[PDB]
Amino acid sequence: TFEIVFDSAREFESLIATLEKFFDEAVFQVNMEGIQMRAIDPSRVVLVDLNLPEMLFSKYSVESEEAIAFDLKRFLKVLKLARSRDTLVLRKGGENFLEVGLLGDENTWFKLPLIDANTPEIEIPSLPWTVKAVVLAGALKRAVKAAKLVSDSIYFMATPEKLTFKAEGNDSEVRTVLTMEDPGLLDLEHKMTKAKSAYGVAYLEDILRSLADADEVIIRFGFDIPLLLKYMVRDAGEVSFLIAPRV
């Protein structure tokens, strides 16, 4: 049994929008100290690790901890009805429905059918990342969107002064390059000197679309090793994607 209240349904819409891009269904582990989800796409290209601690929520109250599961696209449509300043209520009682409320000038209350919550354990390898950077979302979205014109793949490369995103096609190429001189780069740490991998443009663009240009995004990578893109949610939540490399 739970009742959780978040003060921005629209913020939450935007997390759900990123998830629906990769998964048809999500399992939410609802615990005393917060919400967690971990899932992988059927292509095994994309892994999400999501942690939403209770402190993020206006009211948070859970009795028995349990996993709920529901159709991402169904939930997303409800959330797309939220107006500015609507609050969000997620509520579960006795039956097997998630109750969803949108509270504004009117109060709108949906009930959505829950489904089989059988997530098998997902284990996260340790990963020898040699690069780590903090960049602005608008900068990445630039890079990524410039790659798409040229290719389905984007190269992430670093030296210790240099963060470069490049693509190459049959007859075109595109380098976007960031140093400590640019606003979009906040931080750049190399544990070495040569670092290069490729990831699927389509995948990254779907990850970065909800974020506002000004959101900080954390990046970690290496040679032919999964890419990390992590966003802090109100300085407490985490949202983490691992994206498998290419070639």
Added chain:
Amino acid sequence: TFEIVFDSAREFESLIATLEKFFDEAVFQVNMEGIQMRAIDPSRVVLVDLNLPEMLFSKYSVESEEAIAFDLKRFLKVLKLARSRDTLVLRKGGENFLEVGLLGDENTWFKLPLIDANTPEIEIPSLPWTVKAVVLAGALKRAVKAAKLVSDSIYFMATPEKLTFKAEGNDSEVRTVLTMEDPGLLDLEHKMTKAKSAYGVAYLEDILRSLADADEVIIRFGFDIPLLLKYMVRDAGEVSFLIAPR
């Protein structure tokens, strides 16, 4: 023969854009007293009644009382070009054409043909409404829009305390609740204490889309009777829909 002038071609557009979701052609009855329309849609769920008194027009000048009939979608496209402050002119002179003027920074005049002006006399049957309400459009549009997710029809329900719009459909339901403290509900009148009737989501959508969020809408419904959605035009006009229950 007439010449009629309205202050806001854009305002006029909103009305036409509604009529147009339900009809291909409109028959406007032009009288000394004003303009009138009343018809039922081909599908036969919706009745519209439209009174625009002389009062609303900056110039109203009828030389004789005419029925005139035109393609809605051709008229509407005309009005969609109206700019921010444009005046609208309607004029028939001695021929089968409606002179349409959009008067502003640019002056634009259309001649569009009249079609065969034939629509029957119709009686609006007084019917036993148990619930009345004045709500803001925005509120009803959200309600319908949230109902549409779950189902094809939406229930209008009232207690003396509240108006609720519900929908049950497949393995899902939704409820939208309004109380008197909310800005969306200005007035609730009841004769009976309970009220329940179902309607077409798709129709309601179409009636409501031209409305501003802040427009007052009067609703009258009851135990299994057509719904009356009404709104007033600059206070003196009236646009009314009767939607059949399901």
Added chain:
Amino acid sequence: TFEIVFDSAREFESLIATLEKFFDEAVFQVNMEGIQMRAIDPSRVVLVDLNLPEMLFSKYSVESEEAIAFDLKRFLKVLKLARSRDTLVLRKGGENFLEVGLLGDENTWFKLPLIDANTPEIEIPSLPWTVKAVVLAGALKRAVKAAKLVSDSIYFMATPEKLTFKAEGNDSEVRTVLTMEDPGLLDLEHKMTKAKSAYGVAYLEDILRSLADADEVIIRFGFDIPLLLKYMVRDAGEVSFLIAPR
């Protein structure tokens, strides 16, 4: 070897967007004095003339002169990535590719492949035009949109007093009138009393689209002749279009 640096990618985008509606490719003579392009469209009814003198650019280093050709949609799509905060760089080297620089918060550098510069020399004909006029794009946009609703053809007309944009056929007509009292008409020049030619509604639409309502357009027509449609670029360079009549 040339490095040209333009102030506003976004303005440059607007121009490109237009050309693209008409050519899939374009040749650009990069000269010591400016960039020029003359070219008739595959479908034969439109001629573009473009000339952008060195002074428009914030930098105009150009070691030696050459023509360069390229796909427009590819260029265009790049320029559409340009944000508010972006400055445009067009660089050429020994290699056979156009380098394209979006300089703003971050810097993006593209390499687009230069294609075959096979472009006929074209002589701009002498024209017995009778009326030139300066008008606001917005006004003409009205004109043209109003015309589309009635025909694939719009008549451009002039008296010493007014500009009329008229069209007909279906069973309807439409005129848009622009007098000197109207803000949309700045300037009216006459070698003769009147003018009248008819042009492709579609071709106009495509031209006017990247234009803002407040942009000044020079138009110049006569009796059954092409129309010159020409605007300025930072009041220095020009882009002009000739449109065969009907």
